[PDB]
Write a protein that binds this DNA or RNA. Structure first.
Ligand SMILES: [K+]
Ligand SMILES: [Mg+2]
Ligand SMILES: [Mg+2]
Ligand SMILES: [Mg+2]
Ligand SMILES: [Mg+2]
Ligand SMILES: [Mg+2]
Ligand SMILES: [Mg+2]
Ligand SMILES: [Mg+2]
Ligand SMILES: [Mg+2]
Ligand SMILES: [Mg+2]
Ligand SMILES: [Mg+2]
Ligand SMILES: [Mg+2]
Ligand SMILES: [Mg+2]
Ligand SMILES: [Mg+2]
Ligand SMILES: [Mg+2]
Lengths: 233, 67, 49, 120, 252
RNA sequence: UUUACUUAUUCAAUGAAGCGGAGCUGGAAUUCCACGUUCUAGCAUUCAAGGUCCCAUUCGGGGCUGAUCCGGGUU
RNA sequence: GAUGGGGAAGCUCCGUUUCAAAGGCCUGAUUUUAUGCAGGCCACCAUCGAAAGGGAAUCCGGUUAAGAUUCCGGAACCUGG
């Protein structure tokens, strides 16, 4: 106590060279980091035509969790499951004269963009999930309108990576249910009701609404200041 | 599949959606190097039409040329 | 200078073979007087408010 | 994402550098010693001047490999002739070969060594 | 038929500046937080001669606000600045000769030097010996300062542009006759290869527009259009008038 | 034609360090102003001492504050 | 005069720290191995460019047909360890 003293440092201008501070706001980030951040910025600074910016509306957290829980009951065969099915099918058709129907009818989520588009055009899809982050977006921009025209319930959902986990891939960009088990028909109907309430019933209204046009932090503050002064006087 | 829709949509270059995508992507390409590896085709339908297959050994490179 | 002992290159004082004696003395006097004036300025600021 | 990073400079992060684990050898037979004693020491130099150096200066005069340095000359002479070397001086002759004046230590007699290795 | 001398100057082979002996580029401090908000005190360590420059330079040492070290700056010394003088640079610095202040922080009629054309260019205007800029007014809204330049031009600069209070030292330099080709020689030996100058009329037609003729004479008007091309711009380029200047300057 | 907007484009600087918006404190009327350095050619660096909380013990170690918060738009 | 970049149909040109994720050296700890995970210190940059510029340290005597501040004798000095 008597040997230690308070020696406060004067960190004001012209004194006591500044302490190490969090400069993460001022980091000269690599070019790829700057590019991805400013691409995200520019995509909302520009006015986004309504075909895009209908994808900023995604399934809410709870409805998405319910949808993904339902879709997780219809995962496709992994390599091990397919190998086991194939051996139990061969060792059955060889001996018991089965008509290659020694395995039951599979009930699996349908994936692959071309496959799901074909199912939508054939009205076989009972529910379509469209990833919101498909990097070339033209692969899925027509999907909400295609589903709306074919009367197929669709939800724009967060994560091609999540759909990839659904279908045992890294990314999937779509995930469809064409048939569902009887114990899950009611869950599918309720979830389709929620999903149509969020996307398909709103489609005619979101199709005429532009997105983007959002200013940055500083421009927003400047516009708020000038609207407070000029507009409210 | 989706490639027919991609092909028809790619022909509406002066539509609002394609104009927006053009502006954003031209900015991104300009920010990148003059020649740089592209992770995937920007137009998968066009790449398939021109002979690209999504297998190991096929490569896409983006290149900027003065007009 | 790498081949000679420390005694040849220094002087036994606060700045040795860097600053001359008179400059060192001026540094001593300036440091002491300016620190004292800093104390005086601080107390004058505190008693003028 | 939310780390402090008190410097405004971003540096390339340190990543693991795996040592090479080749699937096949690069040469498939290591080369034998390219400069052993037998080609470090080409042959003794037996001019009248060199023989005078052998007689009077305790210095053996050798033609040596143009790639051989003084360490190599010293160790090759030591191995080949079982003598201690006090000093090695070298030059490149005008004919493009290398001549080494190898002064043996006082323990050995260069005339005796030359007699043994066959030039008197 | 030949590339003329003023054309040859642009390639910069023998016409580059002789910069060996120079002390370094004379610049203000980098415009940082301390100067933008308060001030920083430096010390004038040396007032030195710069080769090829009439004005003396002042080496001014500041503390680094973010790292424990000293930063030496090369200012152009204003007249009256002395070694051991404390220089104050920033928005809050006092109106004393040698201090570096934003143009908007000084009153009308202030004499400044090494004035930035834009905030942070570290000094562009009134840098030659004896020259200065005068602050003639402020426009606080859309913050600008109107200033008078050594040439007499009026310029509108950002109020955050900085300048050094006072006049550049070494004034009156051109009042002494050089008196000697050798003195001109030594002057330009440390600047560039622009001396001596051969008159174009003393050349041949191949060498210069003015060359040739059985008498030395220009032959056509020496006033040359602004739109003329390289190899033609010898003489009086885009001259509004010629002849012995009789009348007033500062046209209204 | 004059003018605004900013993200294209353009210019410039920096080791992209303190930008923008709020707030605390004091003064004065929801607003305003202030909000660490100026006799002196010294010195100013060791996650800053101090304060506080935790652990773990004889070495000490860690967090918070000191040094307001928010937006990650380097300016 | 490479690199990063940009230009050029191209041979190549510009530019030399630039619009680049451009780093080895200290060591807490590690010693499943003084290293990877992991405490923490420093960078606005290849390289070439001088036998008259800068620069660690050697002198004397003797010796050959022809070498000598290099050999021999003696006597020193510097650098790295
Ligand atoms: K003529
Ligand atoms: Mg691949
Ligand atoms: Mg030699
Ligand atoms: Mg030059
Ligand atoms: Mg003249
Ligand atoms: Mg003349
Ligand atoms: Mg003539
Ligand atoms: Mg002519
Ligand atoms: Mg003419
Ligand atoms: Mg004539
Ligand atoms: Mg080159
Ligand atoms: Mg060299
Ligand atoms: Mg020399
Ligand atoms: Mg001779
Ligand atoms: Mg000797």
């Amino acid at each position: 106590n008597p040997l230690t003293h308070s020696t406060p440092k004067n960190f004001g201008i012209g004194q006591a060279v500044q302490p190490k501070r969090n400069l993460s706001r001022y980091v000269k980030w690599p070019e790829y980091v700057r590019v991805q951040r400013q691409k995200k910025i520019l995509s909302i600074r520009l006015k986004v035509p309504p075909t895009i910016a209908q994808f900023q509306y995604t399934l809410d957290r709870n409805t998405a969790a319910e949808t993904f829980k339902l879709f997780n009951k219809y995962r496709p065969e992994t390599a091990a499951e397919k190998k086991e099915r194939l051996t139990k099918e061969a060792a059955a058709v060889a001996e018991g004269k089965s008509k290659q129907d020694a395995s039951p009818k599979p009930y699996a989520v349908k994936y692959g963009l071309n496959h799901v588009v074909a199912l939508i055009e054939n009205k076989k899809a009972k529910l379509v999930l469209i990833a919101n982050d498909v990097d070339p977006i033209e692969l899925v921009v027509f999907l909400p309108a295609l589903c709306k025209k074919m009367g197929v319930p669709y939800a724009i959902v967060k994560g091609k990576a999540r759909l990839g986990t659904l279908v045992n891939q890294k990314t999937s960009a779509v995930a469809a249910l064409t048939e569902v088990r009887a114990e899950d028909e009611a869950a599918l109907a309720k979830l389709v009701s929620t999903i149509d309430a969020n996307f398909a019933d709103k489609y005619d209204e979101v199709k005429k609404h532009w997105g983007g046009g959002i200013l940055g932090n500083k421009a927003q503050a400047k516009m708020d200041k000038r609207a407070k002064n000029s507009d409210s006087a | 599949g989706a490639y027919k829709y991609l092909e028809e949509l790619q022909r509406k270059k002066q539509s609002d959606v394609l104009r927006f995508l053009q502006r954003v992507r031209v900015w991104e390409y300009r920010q990148k190097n003059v020649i740089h590896r592209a992770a995937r085709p920007t137009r998968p339908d066009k790449a398939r039409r021109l002979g690209y297959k999504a297998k190991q050994g096929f490569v896409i490179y983006r290149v900027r040329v003065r007009r | 200078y790498a081949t000679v002992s420390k005694t040849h290159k220094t002087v036994s004082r606060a700045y040795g073979g860097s600053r001359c004696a008179n400059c060192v003395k001026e540094r001593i006097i300036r440091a002491f007087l300016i620190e004292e004036q800093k104390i005086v300025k601080k107390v004058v600021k505190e008693q003028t408010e | 994402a939310l780390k402090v990073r008190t410097s405004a400079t971003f540096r390339l992060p340190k990543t693991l550098k795996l040592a090479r684990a080749p699937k096949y050898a690069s040469k498939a037979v290591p080369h034998y010693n390219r400069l052993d004693s037998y080609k470090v020491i080409e042959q003794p130099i037996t001019s009248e001047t060199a023989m005078k150096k052998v007689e009077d200066g305790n210095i053996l005069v050798f033609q040596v490999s143009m790639k051989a340095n003084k360490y190599q000359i010293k160790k090759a002479v030591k191995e080949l002739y079982e003598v201690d070397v006090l000093k090695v001086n070298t030059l490149v002759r005008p004919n493009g070969t290398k001549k080494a004046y190898v002064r043996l230590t006082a323990d050995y007699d260069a005339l005796d060594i030359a007699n043994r290795i066959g030039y008197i | 038929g030949r590339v003329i001398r003023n054309q040859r100057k642009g390639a910069g082979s023998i016409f580059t500046s002789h910069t060996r002996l120079r002390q370094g580029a004379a610049k203000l401090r980098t415009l940082d937080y301390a100067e933008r908000h308060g001030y920083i005190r430096g010390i004038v360590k040396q007032i030195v001669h710069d080769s090829g420059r009439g004005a003396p330079l002042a080496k001014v040492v500041f503390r680094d606000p973010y790292k424990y070290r000293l930063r030496e700056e090369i200012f152009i010394a204003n007249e009256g600045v002395h070694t051991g003088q404390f220089i104050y640079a920033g928005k809050k610095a006092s109106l004393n000769v040698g201090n570096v202040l934003p143009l908007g922080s000084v009153p009308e009629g202030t004499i400044v030097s090494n004035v930035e054309e834009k905030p942070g260019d570290r000094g562009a205007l009134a840098r030659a010996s004896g020259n200065y800029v005068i602050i003639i007014g402020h426009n606080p809204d859309e913050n600008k300062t109107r200033v008078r330049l050594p040439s007499g031009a009026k310029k509108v600069i950002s109020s955050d542009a900085r300048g050094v209070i006072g006049v550049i030292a070494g004034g009156g330099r051109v009042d002494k006759p050089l008196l000697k080709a050798g003195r001109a020689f030594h002057k330009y030996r440390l600047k560039r290869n622009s001396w001596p100058k051969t008159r174009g009329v003393a050349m041949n037609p191949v060498d210069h527009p003015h060359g040739g003729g059985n008498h030395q004479h220009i032959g056509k008007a020496s006033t040359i259009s602004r739109g003329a091309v390289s190899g033609q711009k010898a003489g009086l380029i885009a001259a509004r008038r010629t002849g012995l200047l009789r009348g007033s300057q500062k046209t209204q």
